[PDB]
Design a protein around this motif. Structure first.
Motif, PDB file in Angstrom:
ATOM      1  N   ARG A  10       1.437  20.287   2.351  1.00 40.14           N
ATOM      2  CA  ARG A  10       1.787  21.019   1.144  1.00 40.14           C
ATOM      3  C   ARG A  10       0.554  21.295   0.310  1.00 40.14           C
ATOM      4  NH1 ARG A  10       7.248  20.403  -0.073  1.00 40.14           N
ATOM      5  NH2 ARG A  10       8.274  19.984   1.937  1.00 40.14           N
ATOM      6  N   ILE A  11      -0.231  20.255   0.052  1.00 36.35           N
ATOM      7  CA  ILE A  11      -1.283  20.362  -0.945  1.00 36.35           C
ATOM      8  C   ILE A  11      -2.641  20.624  -0.309  1.00 36.35           C
ATOM      9  CG2 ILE A  11      -2.106  19.264  -3.080  1.00 36.35           C
ATOM     10  CD1 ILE A  11       0.750  19.976  -3.163  1.00 36.35           C
ATOM     11  N   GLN A  54      -0.467   4.008  -2.517  1.00 39.38           N
ATOM     12  CA  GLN A  54      -0.753   5.382  -2.153  1.00 39.38           C
ATOM     13  C   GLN A  54       0.421   6.297  -2.476  1.00 39.38           C
ATOM     14  OE1 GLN A  54      -3.531   7.490  -1.670  1.00 39.38           O
ATOM     15  NE2 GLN A  54      -4.121   5.756  -0.345  1.00 39.38           N
ATOM     16  N   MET A  55       1.596   5.705  -2.665  1.00 35.17           N
ATOM     17  CA  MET A  55       2.711   6.211  -3.444  1.00 35.17           C
ATOM     18  C   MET A  55       2.234   6.988  -4.657  1.00 35.17           C
ATOM     19  SD  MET A  55       6.194   5.537  -3.626  1.00 35.17           S
ATOM     20  CE  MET A  55       7.425   5.814  -4.892  1.00 35.17           C
ATOM     21  N   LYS A 100       0.808  -1.204   0.000  1.00 36.05           N
ATOM     22  CA  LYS A 100       0.000   0.000   0.000  1.00 36.05           C
ATOM     23  C   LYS A 100       0.850   1.266   0.000  1.00 36.05           C
ATOM     24  CE  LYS A 100      -4.102   2.105   0.425  1.00 36.05           C
ATOM     25  NZ  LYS A 100      -5.131   2.097  -0.655  1.00 36.05           N
ATOM     26  N   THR A 101       2.109   1.196   0.438  1.00 36.51           N
ATOM     27  CA  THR A 101       2.993   2.339   0.202  1.00 36.51           C
ATOM     28  C   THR A 101       3.299   2.453  -1.282  1.00 36.51           C
ATOM     29  OG1 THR A 101       3.929   2.053   2.409  1.00 36.51           O
ATOM     30  CG2 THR A 101       5.073   3.513   0.920  1.00 36.51           C
ATOM     31  N   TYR A 118      14.259   7.257   7.075  1.00 36.27           N
ATOM     32  CA  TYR A 118      13.186   6.983   6.114  1.00 36.27           C
ATOM     33  C   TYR A 118      13.105   8.129   5.113  1.00 36.27           C
ATOM     34  CZ  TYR A 118       8.806   5.043   4.355  1.00 36.27           C
ATOM     35  OH  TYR A 118       7.819   4.483   3.572  1.00 36.27           O
ATOM     36  N   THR A 160      10.328   7.911   2.084  1.00 37.16           N
ATOM     37  CA  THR A 160       9.354   7.770   1.003  1.00 37.16           C
ATOM     38  C   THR A 160       7.926   8.135   1.383  1.00 37.16           C
ATOM     39  OG1 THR A 160      10.709   6.075  -0.043  1.00 37.16           O
ATOM     40  CG2 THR A 160       8.377   6.205  -0.666  1.00 37.16           C
ATOM     41  N   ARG A 161       7.324   7.421   2.336  1.00 35.94           N
ATOM     42  CA  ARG A 161       6.016   7.807   2.846  1.00 35.94           C
ATOM     43  C   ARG A 161       6.066   9.117   3.605  1.00 35.94           C
ATOM     44  NH1 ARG A 161       1.402   7.420   1.525  1.00 35.94           N
ATOM     45  NH2 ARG A 161       1.601   5.168   1.205  1.00 35.94           N
ATOM     46  N   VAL A 176      -0.854   9.789  -4.057  1.00 33.35           N
ATOM     47  CA  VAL A 176      -0.452  11.025  -3.393  1.00 33.35           C
ATOM     48  C   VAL A 176       0.640  11.746  -4.164  1.00 33.35           C
ATOM     49  CG1 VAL A 176       0.261  11.961  -1.141  1.00 33.35           C
ATOM     50  CG2 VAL A 176      -1.291  10.028  -1.239  1.00 33.35           C
ATOM     51  N   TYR A 177       1.472  11.029  -4.924  1.00 31.26           N
ATOM     52  CA  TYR A 177       2.455  11.749  -5.728  1.00 31.26           C
ATOM     53  C   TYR A 177       1.790  12.463  -6.899  1.00 31.26           C
ATOM     54  CZ  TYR A 177       6.198   9.783  -2.980  1.00 31.26           C
ATOM     55  OH  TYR A 177       7.048   9.458  -1.947  1.00 31.26           O
ATOM     56  N   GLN A 201       5.343  12.141   1.538  1.00 33.50           N
ATOM     57  CA  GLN A 201       3.947  12.293   1.135  1.00 33.50           C
ATOM     58  C   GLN A 201       3.003  12.422   2.324  1.00 33.50           C
ATOM     59  OE1 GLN A 201       3.014   9.095  -1.635  1.00 33.50           O
ATOM     60  NE2 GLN A 201       3.856   7.458  -0.337  1.00 33.50           N
ATOM     61  N   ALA A 221      -1.415  13.422  -6.894  1.00 30.87           N
ATOM     62  CA  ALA A 221      -2.218  14.494  -6.324  1.00 30.87           C
ATOM     63  C   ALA A 221      -1.340  15.651  -5.870  1.00 30.87           C
ATOM     64  CB  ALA A 221      -3.051  13.955  -5.158  1.00 30.87           C
ATOM     65  N   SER A 222      -0.145  15.343  -5.378  1.00 33.22           N
ATOM     66  CA  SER A 222       0.745  16.376  -4.878  1.00 33.22           C
ATOM     67  C   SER A 222       1.268  17.237  -6.020  1.00 33.22           C
ATOM     68  CB  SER A 222       1.881  15.734  -4.082  1.00 33.22           C
ATOM     69  OG  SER A 222       2.653  14.892  -4.910  1.00 33.22           O
ATOM     70  N   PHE A 228       3.091  16.045   2.231  1.00 28.41           N
ATOM     71  CA  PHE A 228       2.371  16.537   1.067  1.00 28.41           C
ATOM     72  C   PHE A 228       0.890  16.726   1.345  1.00 28.41           C
ATOM     73  CE2 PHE A 228       5.655  14.547  -2.071  1.00 28.41           C
ATOM     74  CZ  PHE A 228       6.557  15.537  -1.722  1.00 28.41           C
TER      75      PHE A 228
END
Lengths: 35, 159, 32, 286, 264, 40, 229
Positions: free
Chosen positions: G211-212, D252-253, D248-249, G199, G201-202, D256-257, G205, D259-260, G208
């Protein structure tokens, strides 16, 4: 002098004439785009 | 109702013109005439007589000193009946706009809300059943009880 | 004139509440 | 081997006016009729049909009436208008069945390679699907008895063939093509969540009533066999999908990337020319 | 640190801190705002006899902190010296909001049939029956009828139609003008039936009042009675309004009822 | 208050000051500060 | 304002809100704050209107970055430096010179040299924690550098002369939370680590969302900006 306060304070709230002026303009805009 | 003039459809262009009519009948509004002038500038014929009949409903009770567009339309409706190749759905109620234009000869008027403070309900009946007389021609005939005299009578003894 | 000074602006508040609600509906029709 | 057919609601509207016949001819409650059509493929189309004057005794339910004045010469008319649109099966209303249905199928299996019975719906309030097909089946048992013939749940659908919406989509007079992401998704949320999980309540009607009063099809041959498919993921506390969370990372990786970065591009979209046309409209008004 | 000088539990040192409160509260509006709970201790203590003042500077620092419902609660706890003041910034605003609460209370309880109300707390009504007396003694009863509008209640209304010297015609256009802002049929007919009687309570009988309540209260029995006055007083020339507004502006069904009841 | 003749007119900063404090210095200079060892 | 925080108009004047947030920046600065103080120093600094008034940003910005002088992570303001301010930042250039230099005789020598200009500053909370800022800058730099340094390495280089007060520096550095440095506990002699593979990666976001979600805040600021004409 008691309730000589709030009605001009409702005339403050006549920005709805201005925001709804933009909405009335917009109604004319897209209404005549449709027409 | 000026915002209601924005309608895409001829029943609410036309019925909006009717709202100008039965809403502002005895008023001295020039802006209603200003609305109806593009309403007779419309390829739908019966909304042009929406302007004929509805402007006849603003030209009840009132003279040229009330608003300068009275005689403009008095000559203008005969002027548009001079055009033979108009629709006679457009000049359908044109002679009717002359009759409403001279109901009494401005001697009588409407009583939707009488001066007494209370309404005059059979006049309200006449105007509301009066409306869609395409669908039934005697709906045109029903405008009897909608008129009250604009005159002055000094009675002390009844004879 | 505090008899009806207070009341009358509410009569001219309700209606623009209704069309303030309603312009979104008409624009929603013009999307269609 | 039938997944689906194409359903024209035209002769379904003939089921509507024969549904108007049965309300005024008398005692006949259920609308029963005979389905025309042509096997082209596993997918099929139904373009016409006809509704039979039919009676059915409540005592000894297997009493059919499929008149051959009503069958043969009307098949000569229906053949005379088109050689293509011949029979394919038949229909009746109600959701479940009719003690006569199987026999009524075998009256016309002499006419068709696969006379289908599509049990129809005159009053739709359903949680599942519309009218649905039932093909000729011989599943019997692992027993070796005489051959079973009761016609099993062979999936169908309401297909839409051709243009035909000069009438239909003029007769919409209400509906909008939603650009999905505009509440249509939550309509599907109500229908699959609600209309799926009340079917799950039908499945606790199954797996409670069959425990209670259910005989031999309590565990015939598909209950444990699809308790396997139930045993995809039914587990106890939280089912512990430990692969699925950094998986799920990886999921949703993406969302959200996109969407960001992309909604920052949408920040250019809205923000920039919103300001330009904004202040043009604002101070260029003077 | 002026409230930490209050570890003594006698109110007599609270009097000297209060002494500081009437002097430097504005410089200490920060300082008082943490003291609030102890002010609560001052209001909960009945042995603290200056609890009126605890509600005073309570509603001062709540007036500064923008609590206004709690400035209303301790505006009520302030006592009797509350209403008498004529300050142009604090007290007329918090009685404007207090009497705003009174009039929305009288609208709420005017919508609440047969009691079960929130009671008049013990420090209400002061500038009601004080500034109301300023407006009675202004001889401009537009305010005095203003409160009667604001209560939807025919108690100060009955006293402001039995009111002192002015034209009775003040009520008369208000006969139409209450018709102007009328919302319900509930006290439309009540005011509509009590003004026609306060005109009968008044010595001069009015004729436009029954010209109005025949076409808004539509009683075919009171016009039979004052029609027996018209047979009695005999002047048909003053009788034109009710006779021919009766012919003019009455409903045909009410014309049938009124010719039924009037010949008697 | 702009009332005069004028209306015609840590990243690496605190380190641009110390790096401008040792301006001709030997902050690095390897072959110099490193091999003065075995020259004698 | 700590109890009557109602300090939020439409912020119409757009300089009032700037220098106002500067002023409460001086307030939270002088109470005790680094992060919120320096970020409204930053926010009021980036809301400084123009260069249309000379000096009024220059002296106020001489006072703006004093909490950042108390961070230890501060660059030297020479592009901010008006040359008319240069003759007035002669202590102050040399003040941040004394900041980045780890010398102690210089640390008390600049204070000794311009305590009068520091009275013109009038903000001597600088000097009560500025020696503290020297040891936090040294431990931040060296703790940032080496994974397993010894406390004797940093200690008798930065003149600590004993292991146990160095253990107190490591203790209050853990307490202040800069590095996860432990001690190979016999007599000192830190065993420790840097922190990478932490860490990457997560956790971005996660940010984010702000941010967003912050971007959609600005989006509806543009829609309400469209509400103007």
């Amino acid at each position: 002098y008691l309730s000589k306060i709030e009605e001009l304070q409702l005339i403050v709230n006549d920005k709805s004439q201005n925001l709804r002026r933009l909405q009335a303009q917009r109604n004319e805009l897209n209404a005549k785009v449709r027409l | 109702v000026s915002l209601l003039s924005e309608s895409y459809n001829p029943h609410v262009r036309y019925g909006a013109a009717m709202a100008l009519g039965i809403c502002c009948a005895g008023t001295g509004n020039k802006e209603a005439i200003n609305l109806l002038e593009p309403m007779t500038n419309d390829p739908v014929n019966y909304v042009r007589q929406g302007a004929l009949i509805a402007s006849a409903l603003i030209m009840i009770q009132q003279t040229e000193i009330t608003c300068p567009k009275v005689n403009q339309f008095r000559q203008l409706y005969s002027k548009v009946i001079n055009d033979k190749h108009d629709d006679v759905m457009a000049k359908f109620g044109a002679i009717l706009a002359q009759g409403i234009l001279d109901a009494g000869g401005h001697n009588v008027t409407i009583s939707l809300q009488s001066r007494t403070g209370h309404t005059h309900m059979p006049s309200v009946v006449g105007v509301l059943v009066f409306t869609q007389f395409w669908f039934w021609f005697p709906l045109s005939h029903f405008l009897s009880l909608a008129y009250t005299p604009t005159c002055v009578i000094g009675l002390n003894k009844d004879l | 004139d505090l008899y009806s000074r207070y009341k009358k602006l509410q009569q001219e508040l309700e209606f623009l509440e209704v069309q303030e609600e309603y312009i979104k509906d008409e624009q929603k029709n013009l999307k269609k | 081997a039938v997944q689906k057919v194409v359903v024209h609601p035209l002769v379904l509207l003939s089921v509507v006016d024969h549904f108007n016949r049965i309300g005024k001819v008398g005692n006949q409650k259920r609308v029963v009729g005979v389905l025309l059509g042509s096997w082209q493929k596993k997918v099929l189309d139904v373009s016409n049909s006809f509704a039979v004057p039919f009676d059915e005794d409540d005592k000894d339910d297997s009493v059919w009436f499929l008149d051959h004045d009503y069958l043969e010469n009307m098949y000569g008319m229906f053949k005379k208008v088109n050689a293509r649109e011949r029979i394919v099966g038949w229909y009746h209303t109600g959701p479940k069945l009719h003690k006569n249905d199987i026999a009524i199928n075998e009256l016309m299996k002499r006419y068709c390679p696969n006379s289908v019975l599509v049990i129809i719906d005159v009053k739709p309030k359903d949680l599942g699907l519309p009218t649905e097909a039932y093909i000729s089946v011989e599943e019997v048992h692992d027993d070796g008895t005489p051959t079973s013939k009761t016609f099993e749940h062979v999936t169908s659908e309401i297909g839409a063939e051709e243009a035909e919406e000069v009438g239909v989509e003029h007769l919409l007079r209400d509906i909008k093509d939603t650009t999905v992401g505009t509440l249509s998704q939550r309509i599907t949320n109500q229908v699959h969540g609600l209309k799926g999980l009340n079917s799950k309540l039908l499945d606790i009607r199954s797996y409670l009533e069959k425990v209670a009063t259910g005989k031999l099809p309590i565990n015939h041959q598909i209950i444990y066999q699809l308790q396997d498919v139930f045993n995809l993921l039914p587990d106890v506390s939280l089912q512990e999908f430990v692969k699925a969370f950094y998986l799920k990372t990886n999921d949703q990786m993406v969302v959200v990337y996109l969407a960001s970065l992309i909604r920052s591009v949408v920040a250019l979209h809205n923000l920039i020319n919103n300001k330009i046309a904004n202040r043009d409209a604002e101070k260029k008004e003077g | 640190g002026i409230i930490s000088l209050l570890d003594e539990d006698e109110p007599q040192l609270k009097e000297f801190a209060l002494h500081k409160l009437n002097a430097v509260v504005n410089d200490f509006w920060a300082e008082i705002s943490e003291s609030v709970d102890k002010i609560e201790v001052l209001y909960e203590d009945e042995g603290f006899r200056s609890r009126q003042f605890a509600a005073l500077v309570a509603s001062k620092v709540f007036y500064h902190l923008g609590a206004f419902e709690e400035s209303l609660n301790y505006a009520l706890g302030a006592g009797d010296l509350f209403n008498v003041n004529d300050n142009s910034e604090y007290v007329e605003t918090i009685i404007a909001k207090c009497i705003d609460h009174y009039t929305k209370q009288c609208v709420e309880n005017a919508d609440l049939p047969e009691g079960e109300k929130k009671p008049i707390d013990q420090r209400l009504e002061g500038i009601v029956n004080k500034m109301f007396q300023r407006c009675l003694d202004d001889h401009k009863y537009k305010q005095a009828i203003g409160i009667a509008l604001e209560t939807r209640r025919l108690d100060v209304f009955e006293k402001t139609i039995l009111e002192s010297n002015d034209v009775p015609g003040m009520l008369a256009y208000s006969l139409k003008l209450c018709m102007s802002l009328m919302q319900n049929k509930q006290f439309r007919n009540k005011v509509l039936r009590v003004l026609v009687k306060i005109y009968m309570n008044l010595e001069k009988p009015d004729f436009i009042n029954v010209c109005q309540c025949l076409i808004f209260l539509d009683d075919p029995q009171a016009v039979s009675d004052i029609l027996e006055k018209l047979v009695k007083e005999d002047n048909l020339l003053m009788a034109y309004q009710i006779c021919f507004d009766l012919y003019e502006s009455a409903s045909q069904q009410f014309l049938s009822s009124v010719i039924q009841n009037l010949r008697t | 208050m702009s009332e005069k003749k004028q209306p015609v007119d840590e990243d690496n900063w605190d380190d641009d000051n110390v790096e401008d404090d040792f301006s001709n210095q030997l902050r690095a200079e390897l072959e110099k500060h490193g091999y003065k060892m075995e020259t004698s | 304002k700590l109890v009557s925080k109602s300090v939020f108009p439409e912020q119409a004047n757009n300089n009032e809100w700037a220098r106002y947030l500067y002023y409460t920046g001086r307030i939270k600065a002088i109470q005790l704050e680094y992060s919120e103080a320096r970020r409204t120093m930053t926010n009021a600094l980036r809301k400084a209107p123009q260069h249309t008034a000379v000096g009024f940003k220059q002296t106020v910005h001489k006072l703006l970055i004093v909490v950042e002088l108390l961070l230890g992570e501060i660059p030297d303001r020479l592009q901010f430096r008006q040359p008319s301010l240069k003759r007035s930042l002669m202590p102050y250039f040399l003040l941040t010179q004394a900041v980045r230099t780890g010398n102690l005789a210089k640390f008390n020598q600049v204070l000794d040299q311009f305590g009068e200009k520091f009275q013109a500053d009038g903000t001597y909370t600088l000097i009560i924690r500025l020696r503290h800022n020297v040891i936090k800058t040294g431990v931040r730099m060296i703790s940032l550098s080496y994974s397993r340094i010894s406390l004797a390495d940093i200690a008798q280089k930065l003149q600590l002369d004993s292991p146990e007060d160095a253990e107190f520096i490591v203790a209050k550095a853990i307490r202040d939370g800069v590095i996860e440095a432990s001690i190979n506990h016999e007599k000192g002699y830190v065993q420790s680590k840097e922190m990478i593979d932490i860490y990457s990666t997560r956790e971005p976001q996660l940010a984010f969302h702000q941010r967003i979600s912050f971007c959609l805040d600005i989006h509806n600021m543009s829609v309400k900006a469209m509400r103007f004409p």
